[PDB]
Design a protein around this ligand. Structure first.
Ligand SMILES: O=C(/C=C/N1CCc2c[nH]nc2C1)c1ccccc1O
Length: 113
């Protein structure tokens, strides 16, 4: 019960791949995505985006063992990036960084096949 299953280890690897990805300048693109702005700070976010997601929530689902496979986790990452790209303009850094991380996620999944 203290030993992680292979699926649990794979989930953790994918999550850390996204979280730890660094660009050529050593920036971790995940930083903005770890925790959403609060409902008090950014109400127009929550009136627009119906299914809010951040990496804190993904990590929480992962620790409660709510992900029974890798695609379930990928789906929540992709919802997060889709939301970021819906709320923020295409010229924005957050939009751009979401595209890159979505690519990093898909590469990671493919490499762990
Ligand atoms: O879009 C996200 C963040 C957007 N910001 C722009 C507006 C703003 C005001 N204060 N802080 C911010 C951050 C986001 C973050 C985490 C996960 C998913 C997201 O869509």
């Amino acid at each position: 019960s203290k030993y992680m299953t292979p699926m649990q280890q794979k989930l953790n690897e994918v999550y850390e791949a996204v979280k730890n990805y660094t660009d050529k300048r050593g920036r971790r693109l995940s930083a903005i995505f770890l925790r959403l702005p609060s409902r008090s700070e950014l109400p127009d976010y929550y009136l627009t985006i119906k299914k809010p997601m951040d990496m804190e929530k993904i990590r929480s689902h992962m620790m409660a063992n709510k992900y029974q496979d890798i695609d379930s986790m990928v789906e929540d990452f992709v919802m997060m990036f889709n939301n970021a790209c819906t709320y923020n303009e295409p010229e924005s850094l957050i939009y751009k960084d979401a595209l890159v991380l979505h690519k990093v996620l898909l590469e990671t999944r493919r490499d762990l096949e």
